Structure formats: C-alpha cells, structure tokens
Amino acid sequence: KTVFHLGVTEADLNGATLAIIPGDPARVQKIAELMDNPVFLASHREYTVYRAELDGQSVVVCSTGIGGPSTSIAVEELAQLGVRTFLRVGTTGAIQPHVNVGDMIVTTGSVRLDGASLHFAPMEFPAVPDFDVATAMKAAAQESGATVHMGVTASSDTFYPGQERYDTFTGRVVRRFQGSMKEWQDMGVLNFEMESATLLTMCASSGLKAGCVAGVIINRTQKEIPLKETEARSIKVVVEAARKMLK
Amino acid sequence: KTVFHLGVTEADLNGATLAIIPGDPARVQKIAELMDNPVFLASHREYTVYRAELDGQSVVVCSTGIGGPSTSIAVEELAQLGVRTFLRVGTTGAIQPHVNVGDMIVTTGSVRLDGASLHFAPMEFPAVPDFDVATAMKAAAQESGATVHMGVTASSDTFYPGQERYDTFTGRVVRRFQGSMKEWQDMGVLNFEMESATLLTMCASSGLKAGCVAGVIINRTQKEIPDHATLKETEARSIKVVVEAARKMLK
Amino acid sequence: KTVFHLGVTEADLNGATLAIIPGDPARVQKIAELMDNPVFLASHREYTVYRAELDGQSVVVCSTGIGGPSTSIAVEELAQLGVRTFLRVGTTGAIQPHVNVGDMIVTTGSVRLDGASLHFAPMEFPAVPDFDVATAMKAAAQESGATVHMGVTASSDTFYPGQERYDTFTGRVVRRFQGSMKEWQDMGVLNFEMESATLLTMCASSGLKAGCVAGVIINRTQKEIPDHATLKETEARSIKVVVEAARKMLK
Amino acid sequence: KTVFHLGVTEADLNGATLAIIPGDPARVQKIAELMDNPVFLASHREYTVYRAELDGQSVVVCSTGIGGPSTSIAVEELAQLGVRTFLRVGTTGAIQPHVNVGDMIVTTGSVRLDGASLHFAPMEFPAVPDFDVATAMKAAAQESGATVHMGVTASSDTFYPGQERYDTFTGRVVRRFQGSMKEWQDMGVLNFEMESATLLTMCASSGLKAGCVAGVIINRTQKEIPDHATLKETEARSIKVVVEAARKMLK
Amino acid sequence: KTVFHLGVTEADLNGATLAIIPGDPARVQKIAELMDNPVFLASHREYTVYRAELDGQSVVVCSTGIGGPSTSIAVEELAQLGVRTFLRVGTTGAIQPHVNVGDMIVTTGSVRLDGASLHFAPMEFPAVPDFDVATAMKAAAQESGATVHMGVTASSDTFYPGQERYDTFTGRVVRRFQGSMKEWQDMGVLNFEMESATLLTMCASSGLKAGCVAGVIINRTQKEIPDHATLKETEARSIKVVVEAARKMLK
Amino acid sequence: TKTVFHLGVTEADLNGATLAIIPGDPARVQKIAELMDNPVFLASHREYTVYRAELDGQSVVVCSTGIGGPSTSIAVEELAQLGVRTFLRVGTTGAIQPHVNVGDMIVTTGSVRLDGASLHFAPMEFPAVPDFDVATAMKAAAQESGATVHMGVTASSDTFYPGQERYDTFTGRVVRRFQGSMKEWQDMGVLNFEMESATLLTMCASSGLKAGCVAGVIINRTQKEIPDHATLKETEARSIKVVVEAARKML
Ligand SMILES: Cc1c[nH]c(=O)[nH]c1=O
Ligand SMILES: Cc1c[nH]c(=O)[nH]c1=O
Ligand SMILES: Cc1c[nH]c(=O)[nH]c1=O
Ligand SMILES: Cc1c[nH]c(=O)[nH]c1=O
Ligand SMILES: Cc1c[nH]c(=O)[nH]c1=O
Ligand SMILES: Cc1c[nH]c(=O)[nH]c1=O
Ligand code: NA
Ligand code: NA
Ligand code: NA
C-alpha cells in the first residue's frame, strides 16, 4: 500500500519505527547524511522522505512543512507505515530574556494556539511529549555541551499575529493575541513555534511517542525578525536523541 | 526588504498586485507558463514563487503548502510586498451526490474547521470571499465549459479526522468530528479542503481580496473510480480557469 | 396546511415560492403595492402578510419583526408553506467613513453576533447569502443608480450594547463588546443590523435561498438622528430595489 | 426626552416606574383595561404602549415582540424613560408531565439558550429574577386559585430547533439541541419560552427589577394544539395575575 | 452501605432529610449544639458529620471543605443516604459599598466562576436556589433583626485570582479575571464566595433543594477593620439564622 | 512577619523551607512528616494541617490540601507567599487502563484539565504539565521502591462522581459533556483519574513554581466504581515513602 501524500510504501522504510521530522524539506538530506547509508525515497509537495541507518537500525527522515495541518498528514501516513516514534527538530524564537540565541529548548508541554490539535483531542487535553523522548532529547542536548532549557512552548497556527508580530501588512493583531507575548512571558513560556501543539497532542492521544527540540535563532525581547550554526547543532542533537531511543 | 520565508523583494514582483496561489509548489510553473514571460523568483520550503505577465500586467504565482498556517505566511509576506488580490486554485473532493468529478466549485463561504482563521478574526466572523473574485471565478469556470457549483466549503486543519476519515492508524475520530460529514452534507456543504477558511478570513478582515476555485477530483459519496483522462483534464481546466479569473480581475 | 404564528395557509400564498421579508410590519403594504394585485392576507403579532403578483407570478411579503428569533419563526413557517427564496430588505447603520448615508449595502457574509444562528449551525459555519440572490440584489441596487457596497455586516442580537452604544440607561457595555466597533471597522465590516446572521445561517444550512440588501440611514461615525427627507428617499429606493431583485430571481 | 423605537416620551408615561411587558401587541390593551384610565400612547413595529393607573400610581404596558433582541430594545428604552421594574407575562409550553395545561409558572431562573443575554453579561452570570418580583408573582398566582410552579425555564432564541421540534421544513435539529428536551426534563426544567433569559439577565445586571409569570397553554409531552376555551381561560387569568403582582410591587 | 468519603450509613442519619452544610469542620459541632441531642457521627478529611434534632426531627450537619469539588462529594453522598434539602451557611466578604459588616446575604443566583457546576449542567443553566429555601432563609435572616440583601453572588474556584486579588506571590491575575471585580460590582453582584455555584447548580439539576445564606464579615470596598465584637456577633447570628431557616423547612 | 490567611503559619515557622510535600488528607501529614527528621506540628485550620520537618539537614514543609483544586490553590499560594518554590503532590487514584494494577504508581506527565481553578491561572490552551525535574525525581523514587511505575496523562476532575463518569449515584445520570468520557480518555491513552493535578500543575507551571504528582492506584475502573477501602493501606504506605525519596532527590 502507498499512502496518499508521502509517496512511500512500508517496504521502502525497511522496518523503520522511528522518524526524525524537520520542517524544511531541504533539511532532510542533511539529517540523513549524519547517519549511515542515506537513501532518497520520495519528494512530493513539502514532503521529502529519506531513510538511513543508525547503529544498524533503519530510521526515516521526513519533512513536515510548516504548521500542524501539514505535519498531521505526515505523522498519520508514517504511522500507517509502522512508525511509532517521532522526533521533531526545528528553529524557534525565545521569549524569555535569559534564553540566548544558540540555546536549545526541549518542550515539556505546548500552549495549544493551533487548530489541528483539536482534531485529535479536546482543548483540556495536554499537549505533552512522551517522557522517554523528552528524556532522550534533554540528554542528547546536554551531552552536546549546549545550554538547554526544559519548559513550555507556545505553539501557534501563524508566524505573525499569533506570535504577536506587528511589523506586518496590517500592523494589527486580533484581540485574542493582543498582549499575548507578555502574558506568555509572565507565565514562564520559553519560546514560540508552529507545530508542537499538533504533533504532541496527536501523538499523546494516538499511542505514538513524540518530542520536540529546537534551536533558538532569535530572542523576541530583542527584535521581531531573524542561524547556520544553531541549525547544524540542532540536527546533531536530534540524531543523538534518536540513538538514545533505539532498542 | 527581503521577506523572511518567501525570499523575494518588492522589486522582484515588478509591480504585481495580484497573486495566484496554488497549494503544490510543482503547480506554480504550470500556472505561470499559461501567462507571458514567466520567471522563477525563489524556492524556499514549500514556497515556490514565479512572476509573469497577463495582458501587460505583472502577476505573481506562489505556492502555499498544505494548511492555513503555511498559507497565512505566504499571503502576509506577499501583502507586505504590495499584493492585494489572491486567487486560490486547487483540486478537491466533493461530499454531495450531485457534484461530479470534473466539476468546479467556487466557494461562497467556508466552515472554519481550522485554527489560523482565529488569528485574524473571532469565530463569529464569516470566512467569505471578495464578491468580485467569486464572480470572476464563476464566469471563468462557466466559460471553460465546466459544470460549476457555488456554495459552502468545509475547511479543515486535518486531512483525516477533520474530514471524518476512519481508514487511519487509530481508526478513531474525536467526538467533535464524529457524525460531522453527514451534518455538513445535510447542511448543503459541497466539499472539504484545508486552506480556504484561513485564506478567506485573513483576507476579508485585512483589506485583501480573495477567492477560491477548485476542480473536483473525488466524490466521497461515489464508490466508482474516476478515469485518468478525466483527472488530467480537470487539473488542466482548473489552472486555465484561475488564469482567466485573474484576467477578469485585472480588467 | 396551517402554521402556528403567521395565520396564513398554503392556499393563501397562491403558489408563491419567493418572499420579500422586511422587518417593519408597516413596510409590508408599501412593498406589496409596488407589485400587481396586492392583497392583505393576515396580521398577527409582528407578522403582517400580503401577497402580490410580479410578472404574473405570486410573491409573498411578510414582516419579520426585530431580531433573529422572530425572523426564524417567519422563515420556518413560510418554508412550511412552500417558500424557498427569501429577500431581506431593511435599514442599517454604517460604520465605515467611506459609506455614506443613502448608500446601499448588499451583505456578502455576516458576523454572527446573534444567538439564533447557533440553533441551525455551529459558529464555524459561515452566515453567507445565496450567490444568485446576492448577485440579483447587487444588480438591482446598481441599476437603480445607487452607490452600492458589497461586504460584511455585523449582525447583533441587541441594538445597544452589541452595537457598542454608550448613550444608554447604564452607559455600560459588557467586556465582549468593549472596543468592538473599532475592531469591526478595522476588519472592514460595513454596517450593523439585527437579523442577517440568523436569516443567512438558517437558510444556507436548510436548502433555502436568502440574501439581504439595506439602505444606509445613519453612519455611526457621524450622527444618530436621520434627516427625514433623506431617510424617506433611501427607504423608497430600497423597496424598489428589492422588488427588482425579486424580478431577477423569478424563473 | 425621546427614544429610538417606542415612540413615546418620558412625559407620556406620567411618572411610571413599573411596566407590564407582554409579548403580543394585541394583549397590551387587554392588560391596560384591567387598570384605571388606560390610554393608548403609541404603536410602532411590534411595540404597542399604553399607560394606566393602579392604586393611583402610573403604570406602563408595553409589548416586547418575540425574542430577546426585540425585548432588549423595549426594556432599554423604557429604562431610559424612568421605568425600573418589569413584569413579564406570557404563554408557555410545559415540558414536565406533572405540569398541567392551565397551570402557571413563575420563573426562578432561566437556561440561557439565547444570544442577547450575552450582550449584558457573560454566560456564567445567572438569568435570575428579582426576588421581590418573583415573590409577588407567586402570591398573585396562588391567590387567583391557580396551580403554581416555581422553577427553571429554558429560554430559547428559536421556537423550533432550540425547543427540539422536529415537525418542521427540514425535520432536522442541530447537534447542540438533539436530545435537549430530555436533558432539560431530567434536570427539572419546567417549560420553554423565548424572552426570559434576555430579560432577566439584562435586568439583573443593570439595576432593574424583573420577573416572569406564564400560563401553560400546551404540554410538550401531550399535544401541540390547544383547546380554545381552556386557552382563553388561562390567558385571562394570567393577565389578572400580572396586574395583581404589579399591585403588590407598588405597595 | 457506608458512603466512601463521609463514612456514615443511612441508619446513622436517623431519618434526616435535611442537612446544614457549613464549610469549616470546626463549625459543625457549634451548629449541632444549637439543636437538641447533638451526636457526633464521623470525621474524615474535611468532613465532620453530626446529627441533631430540631422540633423532634432529625437534621444532619456536615462540613463541605473549601470549594465546589469537596462540596460536591458531601452533597452526593448525603443524597445517597436520603438527604434532599441542603442549607449552606457561612460568613462572607461583600463587594458593594452599601453592604455592611454584620448584614446577611441570601443568594438568589450565582455567577458560575467554578468548574464543578459544569459537571452537572452546561454553563447556560442558572445556578439558582430552591425558592422555598431562599424564602425560608430570607425570613429567618430578617426575623433575626439583621439587614438582609437578596442578590447575586460570584462563586469562584479560587480565593486569589478569581476574586481579583493582587496581594499574592506573583501579583498576576490572568486576563479572564483582570477588571472582573469592577465588572461584577457594576452588575450589582453582592459578594464573592467559593461553593454556591457548584451547590446550587448540582442541586437545581438533580432534584435536590438548596440555598445559601451568609453573614458579611468584611467589605472589599471599605478601608476600616471591623471590631472583634461585631465579627463574633455576625458569626453567631449566621448559624442561628440557618437553624431557624431549617426549622421553617421542616414538614 | 505576616501570617497567611488560611494556613495560620508565618515564614519564620517554616525555618527556611523551600519545598513542600502536599497530600490531600490532613491525617496523612503527620505520617509523611514522621518519615523525616524532627517533625513539628505548626497549625491546623479547616482542611489545612501543616508540619515542618528536616530532610538531609534541610527544612521541608508538609501541608494537606483538602480535596479539589480550589482548596489546593489556597495552600499552594499561601506556601509560595512564605517562600516555598517546589511542591510534591502524593495521593490515591483510579486507573482507567486495564494493564494498570492496584498498587502500581503513576507519575503524571500532563493532566486533562477537567477542573475550573486551572482557568484562574492560565487559559485552557496552556498545558497542565509538571516540572521536568520533579517528574524525573518521582519516577526514580517510585522505581527504586520496587513499585511498578507508569508515566503518562492523568484526567483531573472537579468531581469524584459525574466527572469520572460514575453512575452508581443518587441521580444515576451524567451530564452530556461527560457521557462516554471514560472510554474516550481510555482510547486516548489516559492512565487515571484524580482531582487536583490540573489545578496544581497549571498554577505552578504558570507561576514560576516547580510541581509534580505521584499517585498510588487503589482501584481499576475497568473493574468497578468504588474502592474496597482496605486496599488503601500498603499502597498508601509505599506512596509516602516514594514522595519523601523524591523530595530528597529534589534537595
Ligand atoms: C525564529 C522562529 C521560528 N519559528 C517560529 O514559529 N517563530 C520564530 O520566531
Ligand atoms: C480529495 C481531497 C483533496 N483535499 C482535501 O482536503 N480533501 C479531499 O478529500
Ligand atoms: C440605523 C440602524 C438600524 N438597525 C441596526 O441594527 N442598527 C442601526 O444603527
Ligand atoms: C406554547 C409555547 C409558547 N412559547 C414558546 O416559546 N414555546 C411553546 O411551546
Ligand atoms: C472574606 C471572604 C471569604 N470567602 C471568600 O471566598 N472571599 C472573601 O473575600
Ligand atoms: C480511587 C480514586 C481516588 N481519587 C479520585 O479522584 N478518583 C478515584 O477513583
Ligand atoms: Na505546510
Ligand atoms: Na421581534
Ligand atoms: Na476542599
């Protein structure tokens, strides 16, 4: 059977049960090449899929595109093909003054400022990572020598108003999000990104293990708009986290 | 002055104030070549951007990726660079027995089963197209010979549970969406897709003109499988139609 | 058959499948008399009902009263008696500085600041008109020589706090509506009225065709008390327009 | 001092601080003639207004029309003209088997199945009557010889789906209201009507005293078509009761 | 046979069908000793349970602890053992300048700023007392010589941010509650407490009779400190009043 | 110098403690404190019994919370005012997964917010999640004790009965929101029900406090609704050993 969007079969994955899921299709080959025997499988829309071998075990690398909706398709279709563990890596904007560019964040829970999470569980349900995955990501990030923060991430369906950016075409933010950055800062939230609420909610409510690690490329107390080094370190960390998840 | 995700500048757009926004980056060149002097501008992530000329006026073609969040970035960044009118095209399924594969749908309003629309306006606000764009799309669609339906589209943040698909890894659909397909069918909803609620709400609440036209490629109520010829013709017709709708908007 | 509130039977309607539905019972006779052979049918509560003939076809004119609840009863009972198309005409207060007193507005979608719409479809569903009715109303309004705006209307269950009026007994507006007029202005909303969200949602989710056209009698950025001759001229033009829109809907 | 809809001035009310507010404009004169020196003041739209005198004190009688939105206008405008106490009288459909046709109900709180109440207070706020008014209504109802029930009323923005009626044009009830009549029955709710949630919430949050008393004209567990003599008797007793409750409030 | 939290059996209650339910376990014995033959039954967690006799009839006194969740367990388990009427007593802080320390408040409805009420009825349902209990409490309170206020109480799941207290560890109040005290004050709300929304909603939707009476021991709007004597007298009066209200409820 | 409002202790009383163990039942406080050095009773008021003790030379406080988020929120706030920054919750729980056995322990990784008090600290979108260090310490302490330990999501309810979908109750009814909810949570992989974690974790995670929850399983809800009240002996003893060892790891 060949899934609707990803263009791969179960056989193509060579028994892989773990996927690393970056957002940018261009990052997929970079991650795969950190491992052994990388093989290009397919590319369609925002979904580029490779497989590789890590300590002799097959691993998939598959891009998600931006946002919960496109991520939800990739996760569902990979799960149909046997994948059970999902490691998200990406970039992020920090909102706490003490978090610096180049630091890494492992999400312990996400503020659900998305829509797709609600397609898996009502809002009351926590957007929480698998504890083993979060533990592996913390260990990999700390062992790398990075400065690592564990905490809550605000996960938004937009890059602009939902992250309270004003340098925009309208220069306006809807009532719901006015003052929201300060609110999240006061509540100890570490960072903004756009996929973790969907990923974590869908997996935690569907018997899949997931976690998120991100490299900080901007601090929103400094400016609104932004990283090559941070990105490179982040992907080395996620591969080491995958190594720790292998059985 | 280079936008963060799309990687283009205002000067790159050569004065374009109208964009055609398909979902699939591979479709961008296909639309652009229906116009004059198509030129590739950039490709970053799911965003492939071309410029072209239609009746002597610059037009942008930019893919959106799947879903409201990635669409919202492309529309915002294009608006920063002067684009004011957005014509969405794609292919779609339909959920009504009277809508056939190969037909076209022009959305008159969207059921907001998304999240990004709420980042622009509260749920009470209608996800509705600009009337001139919807009118241009209907006319272009009819002129192509297609059977055209005007009506409501259900716009979902998921392809699977939000469209009440059960053929999935878990086979479960959360309470909110159980029975939802029949509910929308009984309310006259024509089809599902994944971007219109965000696009229409963002634009209608931000001073931008938008509309959506789609070719029907599956019908959730029909067991039969559409033949390859029909599907090929439908994809080609859809992009011919959106370019003709753009021509009507530039007049 | 018979119905619970309107006091008319299917036979009374003489085969009418289209209704013009003003708010004020006193406007019913005025509208009917623009057509041929107007006949008074009944008056009970806020529901005054006439029949007339337009190009030889029976048309019913029925007042709705103020608000979604009373409108929902009239529409349901007219539908039980065979009516399938509903043309709303009324007065409105504009909220945009570029919309002048005496202009006309054809609603392309309503902000659902009502309660009755939720008795037909959840909030995500768009309060949008039938495209043919909206097209007919735009055409009739423009052909009359009026200045016509197509756009979003805020449809409120109250005249006072839900339209952010402070010159009231308490001078208070609940948190939900504080700052709301500025919010709708910034989102491009044209006007306030009190029935369109209910009417459009009910009809769009029930297989009925509906639209709304309105004459601007005040602008909220200006004064609250209309000038009498100006108001009379606007009201007269609005009912001429809605009758011409009905003519365009006849088959 | 004038108001926008009711067409009366403060002077017209002759110092009245209490209003009786039936729904049907035709009931206004019937209530007024139970008092001294009734005088017609105005009729505009669904608002018919009379003044009268009760034990030497001026009282106003003003119809509300159907639903919270039209009720909210009348209450606000009467409050602008000095009215501080509002006694609602109206018909109702009981939903409990132990409540008989011809009984009376005094509402102790309303289920807010409306929209206009939210324009005065968020949903958490209780739609509850002034305790003095409820007490006066219970006493007046009992003194008339009626069987009187105190309890919760479900107050709906629709007559049809929000009261879970299926004998309608579509025969559908939106998900929110499917099974709702059984749910309210099991929660001890007595009856349905369409104005109390708005009236009680707006008054309780605005420093106005309000209450509602109603005669039971049908029981939803029985039949929808009332017997004429029984209904006539119930309606006559209801208005005698509300006038006696007004007398008690003016003591 | 023995309820899980309260640790009592039906036989332990000696036929009681009425309970007085203070919050503080230390108050249970004090209330019981105002009646005849007080007998300690059990103490587990925040639940101290006594029985006593009032005019020859068995009455239960049972503490609830703080908050709706704790209260909901006590009410449920007592209802399993035959209790049908629940009289809540305590002391409270007022938010209206006209309410004085030493006055009594009888709740006519509660603002549902809790969570447990939603486990019995959706938010639309009114948190309202049984009319007989509220009537008995008003009579007992007035007969004591106290100044009594009938009105709305705001019932919060927190003591601190939900009552808009800023003198806290973080000094933060979440958006929902910023400005809320002034909002409730302007809407005429008398006081804050933490159990009535749950109690009243649970009982009103479950066929149980409930009400709440409280003595005012502090006023958020007055800067002075009440003296020890006045506070002592108010605490003593509140429990004498609830026992007299129980007397009025006995059949 | 101040004495907090409910707990009746001062900062000086805590001897520099920055960590609290917070069981629900006041009777459990001494039992936990005696596992440490130099336990001393500080205060008891309402459901709040407070001891201090020393663990590896560091002062620790043990404070009961009572049942539910509202009473828990008071204790946490007042302890934080006195310098406490880390909170370790221990309690009992009902498992809802068939593979979880009586006597197992559960460390909560996130809570389903079926409470009300959490909303007084953060909107519903915010995750009710523990501090990662506390959860890590609790898992290690639990494993080291020889217990079978589960990490996962906990449903945290404002009621013991309908919010945990118990039907062996006075009404035998569960409100629509909670009908079928146990099966839904089971299908979503939720491990267990309790009543305080959503409030505790949300309050702390949004207020700069570290918190976690560990619970001993005393019933499996796939088997029956009510625990025997005897299996709560060995399970309780091991649970408090575990929470003290988790505290040791945090210091
Ligand atoms: C840098 C960055 C990446 N992704 C986001 O969602 N927000 C940001 O600020
Ligand atoms: C065919 C199809 C395309 N896009 C969707 O979102 N749903 C569908 O069913
Ligand atoms: C003039 C006017 C009419 N109808 C409304 O609802 N609002 C207004 O301002
Ligand atoms: C009889 C009746 C009157 N009013 C209503 O709202 N419902 C009813 O059933
Ligand atoms: C005095 C007082 C008591 N109980 C509350 O809940 N709030 C208050 O202010
Ligand atoms: C045993 C048990 C304890 N606490 C709860 O909240 N639920 C349960 O089932
Ligand atoms: Na995407
Ligand atoms: Na009306
Ligand atoms: Na408690």
**For residues C45 and A22, what is the distance between their CA atoms, to the nearest angstrom?**
64
- For residue A195 and ligand 1, the question of a CB distance below 6 A is answered with no
Cα torsion F72, F76, F82, F88: sign: positive
Q: Classify D191 as helix, strand or coil.
A: strand
Name which of F86, F97, F118, F124 is nearest F213 in CA terms. F86
User: Which residues have CB under 8 Å from A76's CB, separation 6+?
Assistant: A202, B159, B160, B168, B169
**For residues D123 and F124, what is the distance between their CA atoms, to the nearest angstrom?**
17
Name the token pair of E80.
Answer: 């399993």
* Closest CA to ligand 1's atom 9: A93
Touch of B by E (3+ CB pairs closer than 8 Å)? no
* CA C158 to centroid of ligand 3, rounded, Å: 10
Cα torsion C195, C196, C198, C202: sign: positive
User: Which residues have CB under 8 Å from D68's CB, separation 6+?
Assistant: C67, C69, C115, C157, D114, D115, D116, D117, D155, D157, D194, D195, D197, D198, D199
User: Which residues of A fall within a CB distance of 8 Å from B123?
Assistant: none
Is residue F173 within a helix (H) or strand (E), and if so which, with residue range? none
User: Which residues have CB under 8 Å from E199's CB, separation 6+?
Assistant: E21, E68, E71, E75, E86, E88, E210, E212
Q: Can you tell me which residue has the tokens 């019933």?
A: F219
Chain centroid, CA C99 distance in Å: 18
Name which of A184, A216, A210, A188 is nearest A197 in CA terms. A210
* CA C93 to centroid of ligand 3, rounded, Å: 5
Q: What are phi and psi of B18, to 5 degrees?
A: -130, 135
DSSP H helices, chain A, are: 25-32, 68-80, 131-143, 180-186, 196-204, 228-245
Measured CA to CA in angstroms, residue E108 lies from D107, D109, D151, E129, E189 at distances of 12, 9, 12, 6, 10
What is the CB neighbour count within 10 angstroms for residue C108? 29
Angle between helices A131-143 and A228-245 (to 10 degrees): 130
Residue F78 falls in the annotated catalytic set: yes
Residue of C51, C88, C149, C220 marked catalytic? C220
User: Which residues have CB under 8 Å from B36's CB, separation 6+?
Assistant: B52, B53, B54
Q: Classify B211 as helix, strand or coil.
A: strand
Overall residue count recorded for chain C in this entry: 251
**For residues A226 and A232, what is the distance between their CA atoms, to the nearest angstrom?**
17
User: Which residues have CB under 8 Å from A74's CB, separation 6+?
Assistant: A5, A6, A21, A47, A62, A63, A64, A65
Q: Does F135 touch chain A (CB under 8 A)?
A: yes
Angle between helices A228-245 and A25-32 (to 10 degrees): 60
Burial class (CB in 10 A: 0-12, 13-18, 19+), D178: middle
Cβ-count burial F22-43 (b if 16+ within 10 Å, e if not): bbbbbebbebbbebbeebeebb
Resolution in angstroms, to 1 decimal, for this deposition?
1.2
Q: Does B174 touch chain C (CB under 8 A)?
A: no
Q: Which amino acid is at A245?
A: M
Is residue A171 within a helix (H) or strand (E), and if so which, with residue range? none
Question: Which CATH number do you get for residue A185?
Answer: 3.40.50.1580
DSSP H helices, D152-195, are: 180-186
Is residue B67 a contact partner of residue A70, using CB atoms and an 8 Å limit?
Answer: yes
**For residues B71 and C18, what is the distance between their CA atoms, to the nearest angstrom?**
40
In chain D, the number of structural domains is 1
Name the token pair of E48.
Answer: 């101290």
**For residues F87 and A92, what is the distance between their CA atoms, to the nearest angstrom?**
30
Q: What are phi and psi of C228, to 5 degrees?
A: -65, -45
Name the token pair of D190.
Answer: 């007595």
Instruction: Tell which C residues from 51 to 110 touch D, by Cβ distance under 8 Å.
Output: 65-70, 72-73, 76, 79-80
Neighbouring-strand partners of residue A9: A2
Q: Does A179 touch chain E (CB under 8 A)?
A: yes
Is residue F152 a contact partner of residue F189, using CB atoms and an 8 Å limit?
Answer: yes
**For residues C56 and D238, what is the distance between their CA atoms, to the nearest angstrom?**
47
- Backbone torsion region of residue A70, taken as left when φ is above 0, otherwise alpha when ψ lies between -120 and 50, otherwise beta: alpha
Q: Does C185 touch chain A (CB under 8 A)?
A: no
Q: Can you tell me which residue has the tokens 């909901």?
A: E72
Q: Which amino acid is at C145?
A: G
Residue of C46, C77, C235, C244 marked catalytic? C77
Q: What are phi and psi of C131, to 5 degrees?
A: -65, -40
Q: Does A125 touch chain F (CB under 8 A)?
A: yes
Name the token pair of A213.
Answer: 């690690």
Is residue C140 within a helix (H) or strand (E), and if so which, with residue range? helix C131-143
Would you name the residues of A annotated as active-site residues?
5, 77, 165, 220
Q: Classify D216 as helix, strand or coil.
A: strand
Name the token pair of C145.
Answer: 């020589």
Q: Which amino acid is at F44?
A: S
Q: Which amino acid is at E108?
A: T
Is residue C124 a contact partner of residue B112, using CB atoms and an 8 Å limit?
Answer: yes
User: Which residues have CB under 8 Å from F18's CB, separation 6+?
Assistant: F83, F84, F85, F86
Name the token pair of F200.
Answer: 């505790």
What value, to the nearest 5°, has the Cα angle with vertex B229 and ends B226 and B232? 95
**For residues C36 and C25, what is the distance between their CA atoms, to the nearest angstrom?**
19
**For residues F175 and F161, what is the distance between their CA atoms, to the nearest angstrom?**
11
Is residue A16 a contact partner of residue A51, using CB atoms and an 8 Å limit?
Answer: yes
Is residue A19 a contact partner of residue A61, using CB atoms and an 8 Å limit?
Answer: yes
Burial class (CB in 10 A: 0-12, 13-18, 19+), C29: middle
Name the token pair of C149.
Answer: 């705006």
Q: What are phi and psi of D165, to 5 degrees?
A: -90, 130
What is the per-residue DSSP string for E7-66? Answer: --BTGGGTT--EEEEES-HHHHHHHHTTSEEEEEEEEETTEEEEEEEETTEEEEEE---S
Measured CA to CA in angstroms, residue A217 lies from A226, B6, B43, B72 at distances of 7, 18, 21, 21
**For residues F222 and F235, what is the distance between their CA atoms, to the nearest angstrom?**
19
Neighbouring-strand partners of residue B37: none
Is residue F107 a contact partner of residue F214, using CB atoms and an 8 Å limit?
Answer: yes
Q: Can you tell me which residue has the tokens 């960072």?
A: A191
Name which of A106, A146, A148, A156 is nearest A129 in CA terms. A106
User: Which residues of B fall within a CB distance of 8 Å from C205?
Assistant: 187-188
Name the token pair of A236.
Answer: 């080395």
* Closest CA to ligand 5's atom 9: E93
Q: What are phi and psi of E69, to 5 degrees?
A: -60, -45
Is residue A61 a contact partner of residue A32, using CB atoms and an 8 Å limit?
Answer: yes
Name the token pair of A135.
Answer: 């533990």
* Residue range of the domain that includes B108: 1-251
Name which of D70, D129, D122, D69 is nearest D105 in CA terms. D129
* C82 to chain D, closest Cα gap in Å: 9
**For residues D12 and C45, what is the distance between their CA atoms, to the nearest angstrom?**
24
Compare all CA atoms of chain C with the CA of D161 and give the residue at the minimum distance. C119
**For residues F120 and F77, what is the distance between their CA atoms, to the nearest angstrom?**
12
Name the token pair of C1.
Answer: 């058959």
- Backbone discontinuities in chain D, residue before each (C to N > 2.5 A): none
**For residues E242 and F3, what is the distance between their CA atoms, to the nearest angstrom?**
31
Is residue B145 a contact partner of residue B100, using CB atoms and an 8 Å limit?
Answer: no
Burial class (CB in 10 A: 0-12, 13-18, 19+), D222: exposed
**For residues C46 and C39, what is the distance between their CA atoms, to the nearest angstrom?**
18
Name the token pair of D216.
Answer: 């039971």
Is residue C133 a contact partner of residue C210, using CB atoms and an 8 Å limit?
Answer: yes
* Closest CA to ligand 2's atom 1: B93
- For residue A219 and ligand 1, the question of a CB distance below 6 A is answered with no
Q: Can you tell me which residue has the tokens 């708010």?
A: C23
Chain C interface, best mutation among D3, D70, D165, by max C CB count within 10 A? D70
- Are the Cβ atoms of F73 and E175 closer than 8 angstroms? no
Angle between helices C68-80 and C196-204 (to 10 degrees): 30
The DSSP 8-state label assigned to residue F18 in this structure reads: -
The DSSP 8-state label assigned to residue A45 in this structure reads: T
Q: Side-chain half-sphere of C95: how many Cα atoms within 13 Å?
A: 22
User: Which residues have CB under 8 Å from D44's CB, separation 6+?
Assistant: D5, D6, D7
**For residues E201 and F69, what is the distance between their CA atoms, to the nearest angstrom?**
18
Q: Of the ligands numbered here, which is closest to the C-alpha atom of C225? A: 3
User: Which residues have CB under 8 Å from A199's CB, separation 6+?
Assistant: A21, A68, A71, A75, A86, A88, A210, A212
**For residues A78 and D88, what is the distance between their CA atoms, to the nearest angstrom?**
62
Compare all CA atoms of chain E with the CA of C173 and give the residue at the minimum distance. E183
Is residue F59 a contact partner of residue F184, using CB atoms and an 8 Å limit?
Answer: no
- Are the Cβ atoms of B125 and C187 closer than 8 angstroms? yes
Is residue B194 a contact partner of residue B108, using CB atoms and an 8 Å limit?
Answer: no
Q: Which amino acid is at D241?
A: V
Name the token pair of A151.
Answer: 């905490």
Name which of D92, D90, D74 is nearest D19 in CA terms. D74
Q: Assign 3-class secondary structure to D93-109.
A: EECCCCCCCCCEEEEEE
* Closest CA to ligand 1's atom 6: A193
Is residue F93 a contact partner of residue F217, using CB atoms and an 8 Å limit?
Answer: yes
The DSSP 8-state label assigned to residue E2 in this structure reads: B
What is the per-residue DSSP string for B145-197? Answer: T--EEEEEEEEES-SSGGGT--SSSS----GGGTTHHHHHHHTT--EEESSHH
Radius of gyration (C-alpha) of chain C in whole angstroms: 17
Q: Can you tell me which residue has the tokens 């549902």?
A: E112
Chain centroid, CA A229 distance in Å: 18
* E183 to chain C, closest Cα gap in Å: 8
Experimental method: X-ray
Is residue E71 a contact partner of residue E195, using CB atoms and an 8 Å limit?
Answer: yes
User: Which residues have CB under 8 Å from B56's CB, separation 6+?
Assistant: none
Measured CA to CA in angstroms, residue F112 lies from A169, B182, D171, F67, F195 at distances of 38, 29, 37, 17, 11
